[PDB]
Design a binder for this molecule. Structure first.
Ligand SMILES: Nc1ncnc2c1ncn2[C@@H]1O[C@H](CSCC[C@H](N)C(=O)O)[C@@H](O)[C@H]1O
Ligand SMILES: Cn1cc(-c2ccccc2)cc(O)c1=O
Ligand SMILES: [Cl-]
Ligand SMILES: [Mg+2]
Length: 213
């Protein structure tokens, strides 16, 4: 099996069905004790939690699902009726994420789409009946953060106040995105220093709030 399948099995055997916090704790334990994996993790996850609670977003888009850790993390804090859409290019991972969400009992709040963000984003309004997004979590390949941000604006998916929250702005880093949002009068940016998941390595999240017209 793969590491991702091992993580899912560990959750199924070490967490409580329908209990998202137990799911997160199981993944974090596995990744600290058994095998590292690129989940956003608990340190950065606590910052994410605080941001989600501040904005209470009704519609969140996540780019990059992997095994579903961050989707579980965000969806467990959404208000009744609020929704998360997550995009995942790797079909094996999309299938694991669906199973992870099912186990957590969050399947009614989350829609996991198997495809590339750059292909799915232009379909959100017409196919998925999206108007604008309240929050976007960027956590896919780091060279897509900037192009997908520009694409989201082109497609009319950002509004005044839309919150972009970007993982890994230090490690691996996303230099073009970071320079762009920090230099743009159309974003108000804040940096949240933290640590790479499961490791004693500095990382951080960037929050970039869209201001533009
Ligand atoms: N263009 C793209 N569109 C959708 N998914 C992408 C993508 N490029 C990479 N990915 C996916 O982005 C993921 C990065 S890891 C995501 C970790 C997850 N957010 C968590 O914290 O739990 C990988 O699973 C990868 O397959
Ligand atoms: C995509 N991705 C990759 C890493 C990573 C991979 C290899 C060494 C260090 C970091 C961490 C992430 O949070 C992430 O989203
Ligand atoms: Cl952590
Ligand atoms: Mg990440």
């Amino acid at each position: 099996d793969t590491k991702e399948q091992r993580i899912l099995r560990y959750v199924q055997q070490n967490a409580k069905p329908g209990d998202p916090q137990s799911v997160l704790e199981a993944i974090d334990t596995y990744c600290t004790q058994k095998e590292w994996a690129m989940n956003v993790g608990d340190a950065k996850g606590q910052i994410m939690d605080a941001v989600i609670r501040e904005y209470s977003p009704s519609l969140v888009l996540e780019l990059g699902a992997y095994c579903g850790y961050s989707a579980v993390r965000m969806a467990r804090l959404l208000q009744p009726g609020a929704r998360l859409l997550t995009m995942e290019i790797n079909p094996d991972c999309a299938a694991i994420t669906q199973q992870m969400l099912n186990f957590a009992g969050l399947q009614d709040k989350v829609t996991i789409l198997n495809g590339a963000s750059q292909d799915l984003i232009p379909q959100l309004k017409k196919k998925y009946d999206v108007d604008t997004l309240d929050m976007v979590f960027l956590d896919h390949w780091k060279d897509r953060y900037l192009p997908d941000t520009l694409l989201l604006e082109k497609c009319g998916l950002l509004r005044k106040g839309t919150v972009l929250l970007a993982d890994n702005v230090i490690v691996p880093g996303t230099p073009d995105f970071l320079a762009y949002v920090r230099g743009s009068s159309s974003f108000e940016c804040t940096h949240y220093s933290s640590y790479l998941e499961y490791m004693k390595v500095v990382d951080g999240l960037e929050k970039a709030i869209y201001q533009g017209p």
